[PDB]
Amino acid sequence: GFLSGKRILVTGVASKLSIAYGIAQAMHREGAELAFTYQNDKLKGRVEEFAAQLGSDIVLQCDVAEDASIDTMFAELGKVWPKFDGFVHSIGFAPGDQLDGDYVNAVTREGFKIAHDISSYSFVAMAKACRSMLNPGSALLTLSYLGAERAIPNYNVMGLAKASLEANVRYMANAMGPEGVRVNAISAGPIRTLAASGIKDFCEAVTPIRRTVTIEDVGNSAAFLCSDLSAGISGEVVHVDGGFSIAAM
């Protein structure tokens, strides 16, 4: 398929409901060789078990809060893939107290710091650590949300972090393009994943396609953006939300 001969690292697989899971089955269907990271020991077996289904045995600890963990992870990966063709960054976090109710009351300095570090900085932190391993033609991809561009109740400081993240996409694109690397985001519509219970009160009637997008839709667009078919696209946030953001009333 259209990713044959590519090697792609995939972060953030937590269950079969994860966006990262849909992106992985899609790139896998399309002929990519895959490798996987997992945040910590609680998810090691699970992620090894999801990896195994997709015929990868490359499954590595990576907590993106830690420079040493990202560095170690890429060192270990370089033993099997001294070069590869990019990564999918599918990782968000803010402490639970940040997303309950009025934004200005819930936000704290520490909550802001963690949300931005894990949801935004980690993307460029991964890029720094593997920059010399990337082939020409490589593509990096992260996931964002409409909360970057609009004030969405309860999403709160995550909206700020995703705005920081989309700006990260542009700065990374502009920096890395000259060495042959593209960097994009998918602004995904809402899907019912493990991380979405963290959000309070979690629209298909006012989406133009009249249904919510699935991890399959998101996965297919992802595969496209990490392939040579999208060689003309970098620094872009592609809305995969069924047209929701372009509608009003």
Next chain:
Amino acid sequence: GFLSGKRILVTGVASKLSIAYGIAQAMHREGAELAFTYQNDKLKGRVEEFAAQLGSDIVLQCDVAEDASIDTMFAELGKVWPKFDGFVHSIGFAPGDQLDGDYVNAVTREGFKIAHDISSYSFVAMAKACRSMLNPGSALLTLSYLGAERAIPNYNVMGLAKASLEANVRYMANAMGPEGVRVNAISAGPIRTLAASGIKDFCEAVTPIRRTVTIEDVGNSAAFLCSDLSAGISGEVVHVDGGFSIAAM
């Protein structure tokens, strides 16, 4: 390939340099069945000859200035494709006097009217005329340019028309989504085509990928947007300009 079982009409093939030409070879490579329109008798043989290469014999006159021409064209097409899966709208025009020098001096009421009618209205005019022929899963695609969003010297009233066109993309998406049709645009970076001699003084050093996009890049993104792989994307303007618009200085 990823358009097998799709039938797609392609307008605006004028030479081998046309964006429509790149989109057609790409959809053709990907297993689509194709049909072609041509503006008038001056391009009939040429377009039949380009069609023939791509193994289509469906080649029909269509001047989009004329409701009767669009209606006749779809009547003729319905004899061979009573149903199909969408069309590529790759058609722009403004009289030559519109694009020389200062915008407020060059623009006229008639120039404005023609630019908008041919470059913007024609897209929804085609949609009106074939609406009942479209399958569920159909996708419509037009081509726009950065001149819709920024004041670009000499591009002049075409910038207004392309802004009208991108708004057309949203209104069409929102209207047709409920019956299972998606509608998008590609905002293409500059390529050296037949229509670009019309533009005066026609940047790769400040594009992040450090080269201009080709009709191949544009064609591959096009194919994607008219395929089921992009089923989560409607009402969107995708920038295929190598990241040019997201850079400054």
Next chain:
Amino acid sequence: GFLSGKRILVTGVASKLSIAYGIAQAMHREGAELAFTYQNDKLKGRVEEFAAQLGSDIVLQCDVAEDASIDTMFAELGKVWPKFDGFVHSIGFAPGDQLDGDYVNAVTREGFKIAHDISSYSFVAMAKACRSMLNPGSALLTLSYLGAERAIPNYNVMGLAKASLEANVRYMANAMGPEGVRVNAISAGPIEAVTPIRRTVTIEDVGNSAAFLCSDLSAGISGEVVHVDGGFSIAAMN
């Protein structure tokens, strides 16, 4: 006030509810000298009454569908204001059939053409017609709506026409900036529980922002679409 010294042409007064009417009051308050146009004989008396109440007797016919009507108006204005400081374009139209139901079914070639001509081309037409009359420091203003940027039901082809108008703003700001003329738009909210300010905007609110954008206070702003919609467009799922 912050417009003393300025002479501003105001189009589009049709009633005391008109956006142009709120704009004119606010501009008069801030000390501008005002002149007015009226589309046709049906509105002439209303515009003359309102102009009198503001201390103006410059009240000129202008139908922006006609190049000759625009030229004749500016030749008449020239007799009393050979130079002036810009104008407010507060004009919109599409045939009523364009606004009824599903967009693709309602839009027609003629409806599209009329909507773009009246709602967008007429802004630059006015600018061509008065260009040598503009002082350095001039400011042109037009009025737009969120339907330029989102698909809003029934607003239909008026949305394309507004998107065209917002591009016209940019192209005009770019062309006329070197001669000392700024061009901007207000994207006004409709004149409520999901609006951040928790109320709809009024023609007073619109008027005050329009006065600003036509004054030397806004000298740093050109080519800009300013949202005066209470925060509505930046909120989602409130």
Next chain:
Amino acid sequence: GFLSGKRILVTGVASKLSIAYGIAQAMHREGAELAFTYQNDKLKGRVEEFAAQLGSDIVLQCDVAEDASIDTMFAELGKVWPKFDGFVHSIGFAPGDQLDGDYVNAVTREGFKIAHDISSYSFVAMAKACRSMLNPGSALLTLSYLGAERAIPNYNVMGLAKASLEANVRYMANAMGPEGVRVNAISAGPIEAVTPIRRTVTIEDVGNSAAFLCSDLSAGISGEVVHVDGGFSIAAMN
């Protein structure tokens, strides 16, 4: 003037070239009563001199890296202004190493953290700390730059920090709108042949727009990033 009746806190004066300094002059001209903060002992005398020249003697230490410094400042302000009408946030910082060369190579976790904390979090921190002190009709303003929206060389992580700040504006406008508080930003140009107005913006131009956005004239505007950059961001390849 159009700010008479208003009491506005101004942060970020460091010199007569500071954006905050142009803002304060313009606000004083339009009749506002002013109060000032200063980051540290190095800037205290400059801020006191300037405040004296404007007829103010409210000059309070505030380092926005510290929650305690922000709380203590607002407790001191409360002794003379138990209620007030909003504040201008004119504060930006990243370690100098963040701004040197290729973005990906210069950015570090600590640099990123400091840039976002000082340049974005501190806007809402101030708002939490004074929220019950704000009158209905209040207006918060912050300052941003085009590097929030485009990749500009060397501006590097300050661009992410500004994008965060512009989202903070929206989220804040949404949260505080129901209590009668507006929140906006100015995206200022750098303080020229491809700028539509054919000159860079001045701190006077910025000041006048900031005075507007903090006055009841802008009552219809909230959650908005207004570009005061002479049209620069809407032009291409001039």
